mmCIF file with all atom_site columns, C-alpha atoms and ligand atoms in Angstrom:
data_model
loop_
_atom_site.group_PDB
_atom_site.id
_atom_site.type_symbol
_atom_site.label_atom_id
_atom_site.label_alt_id
_atom_site.label_comp_id
_atom_site.label_asym_id
_atom_site.label_entity_id
_atom_site.label_seq_id
_atom_site.pdbx_PDB_ins_code
_atom_site.Cartn_x
_atom_site.Cartn_y
_atom_site.Cartn_z
_atom_site.occupancy
_atom_site.B_iso_or_equiv
_atom_site.pdbx_formal_charge
_atom_site.auth_seq_id
_atom_site.auth_comp_id
_atom_site.auth_asym_id
_atom_site.auth_atom_id
_atom_site.pdbx_PDB_model_num
ATOM   1   C  CA  . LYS A 1 1   ? 29.238 -24.549 -12.079 1.00 36.05 ? 1   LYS A CA  1
ATOM   2   C  CA  . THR A 1 2   ? 27.727 -21.293 -13.654 1.00 38.41 ? 2   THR A CA  1
ATOM   3   C  CA  . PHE A 1 3   ? 29.805 -19.219 -16.154 1.00 39.40 ? 3   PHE A CA  1
ATOM   4   C  CA  . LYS A 1 4   ? 30.187 -16.201 -13.766 1.00 39.74 ? 4   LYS A CA  1
ATOM   5   C  CA  . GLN A 1 5   ? 31.584 -18.628 -11.083 1.00 39.64 ? 5   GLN A CA  1
ATOM   6   C  CA  . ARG A 1 6   ? 34.249 -20.107 -13.487 1.00 39.19 ? 6   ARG A CA  1
ATOM   7   C  CA  . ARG A 1 7   ? 35.700 -16.762 -14.791 1.00 37.10 ? 7   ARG A CA  1
ATOM   8   C  CA  . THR A 1 8   ? 36.807 -13.472 -13.059 1.00 36.42 ? 8   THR A CA  1
ATOM   9   C  CA  . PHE A 1 9   ? 34.955 -10.302 -14.228 1.00 37.50 ? 9   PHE A CA  1
ATOM   10  C  CA  . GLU A 1 10  ? 38.414 -9.350  -15.755 1.00 34.78 ? 10  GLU A CA  1
ATOM   11  C  CA  . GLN A 1 11  ? 38.458 -12.605 -17.814 1.00 32.42 ? 11  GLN A CA  1
ATOM   12  C  CA  . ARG A 1 12  ? 34.835 -12.319 -19.146 1.00 28.78 ? 12  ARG A CA  1
ATOM   13  C  CA  . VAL A 1 13  ? 35.490 -8.656  -20.167 1.00 27.14 ? 13  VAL A CA  1
ATOM   14  C  CA  . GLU A 1 14  ? 38.748 -9.644  -21.998 1.00 25.05 ? 14  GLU A CA  1
ATOM   15  C  CA  . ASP A 1 15  ? 36.976 -12.493 -23.852 1.00 19.61 ? 15  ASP A CA  1
ATOM   16  C  CA  . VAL A 1 16  ? 34.195 -10.108 -25.082 1.00 22.31 ? 16  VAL A CA  1
ATOM   17  C  CA  . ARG A 1 17  ? 37.011 -7.731  -26.236 1.00 23.65 ? 17  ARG A CA  1
ATOM   18  C  CA  . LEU A 1 18  ? 38.560 -10.653 -28.282 1.00 24.36 ? 18  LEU A CA  1
ATOM   19  C  CA  . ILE A 1 19  ? 35.081 -11.645 -29.743 1.00 25.33 ? 19  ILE A CA  1
ATOM   20  C  CA  . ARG A 1 20  ? 34.634 -7.981  -30.847 1.00 22.08 ? 20  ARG A CA  1
ATOM   21  C  CA  . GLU A 1 21  ? 38.049 -8.092  -32.589 1.00 21.98 ? 21  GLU A CA  1
ATOM   22  C  CA  . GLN A 1 22  ? 37.789 -11.608 -34.149 1.00 22.85 ? 22  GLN A CA  1
ATOM   23  C  CA  . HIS A 1 23  ? 33.943 -11.870 -34.682 1.00 23.00 ? 23  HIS A CA  1
ATOM   24  C  CA  . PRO A 1 24  ? 32.926 -8.210  -34.925 1.00 23.28 ? 24  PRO A CA  1
ATOM   25  C  CA  . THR A 1 25  ? 29.430 -9.052  -36.471 1.00 24.78 ? 25  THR A CA  1
ATOM   26  C  CA  . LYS A 1 26  ? 28.494 -11.628 -33.741 1.00 24.46 ? 26  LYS A CA  1
ATOM   27  C  CA  . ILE A 1 27  ? 26.560 -11.152 -30.440 1.00 27.91 ? 27  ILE A CA  1
ATOM   28  C  CA  . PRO A 1 28  ? 28.399 -12.942 -27.533 1.00 26.26 ? 28  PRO A CA  1
ATOM   29  C  CA  . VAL A 1 29  ? 25.753 -14.988 -25.724 1.00 25.40 ? 29  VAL A CA  1
ATOM   30  C  CA  . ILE A 1 30  ? 26.015 -17.163 -22.578 1.00 25.09 ? 30  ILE A CA  1
ATOM   31  C  CA  . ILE A 1 31  ? 23.165 -19.793 -22.622 1.00 24.22 ? 31  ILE A CA  1
ATOM   32  C  CA  . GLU A 1 32  ? 22.705 -21.975 -19.473 1.00 25.32 ? 32  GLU A CA  1
ATOM   33  C  CA  . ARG A 1 33  ? 20.213 -24.612 -18.291 1.00 29.22 ? 33  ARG A CA  1
ATOM   34  C  CA  . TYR A 1 34  ? 18.068 -23.548 -15.266 1.00 30.48 ? 34  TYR A CA  1
ATOM   35  C  CA  . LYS A 1 35  ? 19.841 -25.196 -12.271 1.00 31.66 ? 35  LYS A CA  1
ATOM   36  C  CA  . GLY A 1 36  ? 16.406 -26.659 -11.203 1.00 28.53 ? 36  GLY A CA  1
ATOM   37  C  CA  . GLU A 1 37  ? 15.687 -28.176 -14.692 1.00 28.38 ? 37  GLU A CA  1
ATOM   38  C  CA  . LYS A 1 38  ? 14.476 -31.873 -14.864 1.00 31.14 ? 38  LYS A CA  1
ATOM   39  C  CA  . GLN A 1 39  ? 13.452 -32.656 -18.523 1.00 30.17 ? 39  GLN A CA  1
ATOM   40  C  CA  . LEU A 1 40  ? 15.708 -30.680 -21.006 1.00 30.64 ? 40  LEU A CA  1
ATOM   41  C  CA  . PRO A 1 41  ? 19.358 -31.815 -21.644 1.00 30.85 ? 41  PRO A CA  1
ATOM   42  C  CA  . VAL A 1 42  ? 22.434 -29.544 -21.124 1.00 31.43 ? 42  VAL A CA  1
ATOM   43  C  CA  . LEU A 1 43  ? 24.067 -27.839 -24.180 1.00 31.24 ? 43  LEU A CA  1
ATOM   44  C  CA  . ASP A 1 44  ? 27.448 -28.984 -25.665 1.00 30.63 ? 44  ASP A CA  1
ATOM   45  C  CA  . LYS A 1 45  ? 28.857 -25.478 -24.775 1.00 34.81 ? 45  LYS A CA  1
ATOM   46  C  CA  . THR A 1 46  ? 28.115 -22.238 -22.806 1.00 37.38 ? 46  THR A CA  1
ATOM   47  C  CA  . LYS A 1 47  ? 29.432 -19.435 -25.106 1.00 38.01 ? 47  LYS A CA  1
ATOM   48  C  CA  . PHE A 1 48  ? 27.580 -18.711 -28.439 1.00 36.54 ? 48  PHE A CA  1
ATOM   49  C  CA  . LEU A 1 49  ? 28.350 -16.231 -31.272 1.00 36.16 ? 49  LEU A CA  1
ATOM   50  C  CA  . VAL A 1 50  ? 24.921 -15.308 -32.694 1.00 33.75 ? 50  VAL A CA  1
ATOM   51  C  CA  . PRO A 1 51  ? 24.740 -13.398 -36.072 1.00 32.37 ? 51  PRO A CA  1
ATOM   52  C  CA  . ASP A 1 52  ? 23.489 -9.930  -35.077 1.00 30.78 ? 52  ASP A CA  1
ATOM   53  C  CA  . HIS A 1 53  ? 20.554 -9.759  -37.677 1.00 30.50 ? 53  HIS A CA  1
ATOM   54  C  CA  . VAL A 1 54  ? 18.611 -12.802 -36.282 1.00 28.19 ? 54  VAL A CA  1
ATOM   55  C  CA  . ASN A 1 55  ? 15.482 -11.991 -34.158 1.00 28.02 ? 55  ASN A CA  1
ATOM   56  C  CA  . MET A 1 56  ? 14.728 -13.789 -30.786 1.00 29.73 ? 56  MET A CA  1
ATOM   57  C  CA  . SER A 1 57  ? 12.223 -16.162 -32.491 1.00 31.19 ? 57  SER A CA  1
ATOM   58  C  CA  . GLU A 1 58  ? 15.111 -17.445 -34.700 1.00 34.01 ? 58  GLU A CA  1
ATOM   59  C  CA  . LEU A 1 59  ? 17.516 -17.761 -31.632 1.00 34.88 ? 59  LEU A CA  1
ATOM   60  C  CA  . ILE A 1 60  ? 14.856 -19.925 -29.876 1.00 34.60 ? 60  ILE A CA  1
ATOM   61  C  CA  . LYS A 1 61  ? 14.718 -22.200 -33.042 1.00 35.28 ? 61  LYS A CA  1
ATOM   62  C  CA  . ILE A 1 62  ? 18.586 -22.438 -33.188 1.00 38.75 ? 62  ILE A CA  1
ATOM   63  C  CA  . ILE A 1 63  ? 18.724 -23.586 -29.506 1.00 38.29 ? 63  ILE A CA  1
ATOM   64  C  CA  . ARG A 1 64  ? 15.733 -26.033 -29.919 1.00 33.78 ? 64  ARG A CA  1
ATOM   65  C  CA  . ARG A 1 65  ? 17.780 -27.469 -32.914 1.00 34.97 ? 65  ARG A CA  1
ATOM   66  C  CA  . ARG A 1 66  ? 20.983 -27.579 -30.786 1.00 38.02 ? 66  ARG A CA  1
ATOM   67  C  CA  . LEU A 1 67  ? 19.122 -29.555 -28.048 1.00 43.47 ? 67  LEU A CA  1
ATOM   68  C  CA  . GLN A 1 68  ? 17.458 -31.668 -30.896 1.00 41.92 ? 68  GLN A CA  1
ATOM   69  C  CA  . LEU A 1 69  ? 13.972 -31.091 -29.217 1.00 41.28 ? 69  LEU A CA  1
ATOM   70  C  CA  . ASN A 1 70  ? 10.794 -32.578 -30.816 1.00 45.29 ? 70  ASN A CA  1
ATOM   71  C  CA  . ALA A 1 71  ? 7.839  -30.295 -31.574 1.00 46.24 ? 71  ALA A CA  1
ATOM   72  C  CA  . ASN A 1 72  ? 5.759  -30.712 -28.322 1.00 47.58 ? 72  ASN A CA  1
ATOM   73  C  CA  . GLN A 1 73  ? 8.754  -30.535 -25.887 1.00 48.15 ? 73  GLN A CA  1
ATOM   74  C  CA  . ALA A 1 74  ? 8.447  -27.101 -24.115 1.00 46.33 ? 74  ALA A CA  1
ATOM   75  C  CA  . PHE A 1 75  ? 11.283 -24.534 -23.978 1.00 47.20 ? 75  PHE A CA  1
ATOM   76  C  CA  . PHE A 1 76  ? 11.357 -21.104 -22.237 1.00 46.03 ? 76  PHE A CA  1
ATOM   77  C  CA  . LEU A 1 77  ? 14.249 -18.631 -22.662 1.00 46.19 ? 77  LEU A CA  1
ATOM   78  C  CA  . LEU A 1 78  ? 14.946 -15.916 -20.016 1.00 45.78 ? 78  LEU A CA  1
ATOM   79  C  CA  . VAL A 1 79  ? 17.160 -12.948 -21.067 1.00 47.98 ? 79  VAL A CA  1
ATOM   80  C  CA  . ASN A 1 80  ? 19.075 -10.977 -18.344 1.00 48.33 ? 80  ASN A CA  1
ATOM   81  C  CA  . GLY A 1 81  ? 16.988 -12.793 -15.668 1.00 47.58 ? 81  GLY A CA  1
ATOM   82  C  CA  . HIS A 1 82  ? 13.465 -12.033 -17.111 1.00 45.20 ? 82  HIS A CA  1
ATOM   83  C  CA  . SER A 1 83  ? 10.869 -13.136 -19.739 1.00 48.11 ? 83  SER A CA  1
ATOM   84  C  CA  . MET A 1 84  ? 11.170 -11.813 -23.342 1.00 47.48 ? 84  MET A CA  1
ATOM   85  C  CA  . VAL A 1 85  ? 8.605  -9.077  -24.147 1.00 48.51 ? 85  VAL A CA  1
ATOM   86  C  CA  . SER A 1 86  ? 8.712  -10.106 -27.914 1.00 49.58 ? 86  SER A CA  1
ATOM   87  C  CA  . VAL A 1 87  ? 10.351 -12.755 -30.190 1.00 50.90 ? 87  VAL A CA  1
ATOM   88  C  CA  . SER A 1 88  ? 10.339 -10.220 -33.145 1.00 49.30 ? 88  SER A CA  1
ATOM   89  C  CA  . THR A 1 89  ? 13.127 -8.013  -31.628 1.00 48.54 ? 89  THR A CA  1
ATOM   90  C  CA  . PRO A 1 90  ? 16.484 -8.247  -33.488 1.00 49.10 ? 90  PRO A CA  1
ATOM   91  C  CA  . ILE A 1 91  ? 19.285 -9.658  -31.207 1.00 49.75 ? 91  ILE A CA  1
ATOM   92  C  CA  . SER A 1 92  ? 21.422 -6.502  -31.966 1.00 52.69 ? 92  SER A CA  1
ATOM   93  C  CA  . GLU A 1 93  ? 18.624 -4.411  -30.205 1.00 50.61 ? 93  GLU A CA  1
ATOM   94  C  CA  . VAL A 1 94  ? 18.197 -6.945  -27.338 1.00 54.37 ? 94  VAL A CA  1
ATOM   95  C  CA  . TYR A 1 95  ? 22.020 -6.972  -26.801 1.00 55.55 ? 95  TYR A CA  1
ATOM   96  C  CA  . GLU A 1 96  ? 22.134 -3.133  -26.461 1.00 55.79 ? 96  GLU A CA  1
ATOM   97  C  CA  . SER A 1 97  ? 19.470 -3.006  -23.698 1.00 56.71 ? 97  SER A CA  1
ATOM   98  C  CA  . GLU A 1 98  ? 20.044 -6.382  -21.832 1.00 55.11 ? 98  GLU A CA  1
ATOM   99  C  CA  . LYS A 1 99  ? 23.812 -6.914  -22.030 1.00 53.55 ? 99  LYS A CA  1
ATOM   100 C  CA  . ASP A 1 100 ? 25.709 -7.463  -18.713 1.00 51.83 ? 100 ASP A CA  1
ATOM   101 C  CA  . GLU A 1 101 ? 28.474 -4.975  -17.623 1.00 54.04 ? 101 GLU A CA  1
ATOM   102 C  CA  . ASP A 1 102 ? 31.031 -7.719  -18.600 1.00 56.33 ? 102 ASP A CA  1
ATOM   103 C  CA  . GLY A 1 103 ? 29.605 -7.421  -22.198 1.00 55.81 ? 103 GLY A CA  1
ATOM   104 C  CA  . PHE A 1 104 ? 27.913 -10.869 -22.562 1.00 56.52 ? 104 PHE A CA  1
ATOM   105 C  CA  . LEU A 1 105 ? 24.138 -11.326 -23.052 1.00 55.26 ? 105 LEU A CA  1
ATOM   106 C  CA  . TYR A 1 106 ? 23.049 -13.951 -20.412 1.00 53.41 ? 106 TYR A CA  1
ATOM   107 C  CA  . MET A 1 107 ? 20.201 -16.425 -21.123 1.00 52.89 ? 107 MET A CA  1
ATOM   108 C  CA  . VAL A 1 108 ? 18.626 -19.374 -19.164 1.00 53.55 ? 108 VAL A CA  1
ATOM   109 C  CA  . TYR A 1 109 ? 16.252 -22.078 -20.532 1.00 53.43 ? 109 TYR A CA  1
ATOM   110 C  CA  . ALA A 1 110 ? 13.784 -24.422 -18.746 1.00 58.15 ? 110 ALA A CA  1
ATOM   111 C  CA  . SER A 1 111 ? 10.834 -26.780 -19.596 1.00 58.12 ? 111 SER A CA  1
ATOM   112 C  CA  . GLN A 1 112 ? 8.440  -24.657 -17.349 1.00 58.77 ? 112 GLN A CA  1
ATOM   113 C  CA  . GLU A 1 113 ? 7.499  -20.883 -17.422 1.00 59.66 ? 113 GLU A CA  1
ATOM   114 C  CA  . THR A 1 114 ? 8.232  -21.192 -13.596 1.00 58.76 ? 114 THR A CA  1
ATOM   115 C  CA  . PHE A 1 115 ? 12.071 -20.988 -13.014 1.00 57.14 ? 115 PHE A CA  1
HETATM 116 O  O1  . KF8 B 2 .   ? 23.548 -31.828 -29.948 1.00 60.64 ? 1   KF8 B O1  1
HETATM 117 C  C1  . KF8 B 2 .   ? 22.984 -32.902 -29.733 1.00 60.64 ? 1   KF8 B C1  1
HETATM 118 N  N1  . KF8 B 2 .   ? 22.852 -33.868 -30.671 1.00 60.64 ? 1   KF8 B N1  1
HETATM 119 C  C2  . KF8 B 2 .   ? 22.861 -33.645 -32.109 1.00 60.64 ? 1   KF8 B C2  1
HETATM 120 C  C3  . KF8 B 2 .   ? 24.265 -33.286 -32.603 1.00 60.64 ? 1   KF8 B C3  1
HETATM 121 C  C4  . KF8 B 2 .   ? 24.239 -33.033 -34.098 1.00 60.64 ? 1   KF8 B C4  1
HETATM 122 C  C5  . KF8 B 2 .   ? 23.603 -34.199 -34.848 1.00 60.64 ? 1   KF8 B C5  1
HETATM 123 N  N2  . KF8 B 2 .   ? 22.280 -34.505 -34.334 1.00 60.64 ? 1   KF8 B N2  1
HETATM 124 C  C6  . KF8 B 2 .   ? 22.346 -34.849 -32.901 1.00 60.64 ? 1   KF8 B C6  1
HETATM 125 C  C7  . KF8 B 2 .   ? 22.370 -33.193 -28.381 1.00 60.64 ? 1   KF8 B C7  1
HETATM 126 C  C8  . KF8 B 2 .   ? 21.047 -32.875 -28.145 1.00 60.64 ? 1   KF8 B C8  1
HETATM 127 C  C9  . KF8 B 2 .   ? 20.503 -33.141 -26.886 1.00 60.64 ? 1   KF8 B C9  1
HETATM 128 C  C10 . KF8 B 2 .   ? 21.265 -33.734 -25.919 1.00 60.64 ? 1   KF8 B C10 1
HETATM 129 C  C11 . KF8 B 2 .   ? 22.574 -34.058 -26.160 1.00 60.64 ? 1   KF8 B C11 1
HETATM 130 C  C12 . KF8 B 2 .   ? 23.141 -33.775 -27.391 1.00 60.64 ? 1   KF8 B C12 1
HETATM 131 CL CL1 . CL  B 3 .   ? 32.230 -11.571 -37.769 1.00 61.76 ? 2   CL  B CL1 1
#
């Protein structure tokens, strides 16, 4: 069901190595619905190539547009298992500190602050 279930560590690593080669300016991001989530829909895909100059505030807006949310639906984004300290951090900086050993940046969204 989850990304890390579906692919061997060898396969995730090799995919990041291909993203680096073919989309060198993009951050490879895995975005996943909280497995206890009631309200929010699932995304059309799992793997995202985010332009590396956008800040976290702009990534939240991209995903709220991808889910087609209205303006008083709630949305919370965990990075690398934990809350974001700030939405002003550029995703290039967040990638460098929060990336997984496989080389993806892992994110989870839910309708409640409680996951
Ligand atoms: O992506 C979704 N719909 C968009 C596609 C682009 C045009 N506007 C509608 C979507 C959102 C939430 C649940 C399921 C699917
Ligand atoms: Cl690129």
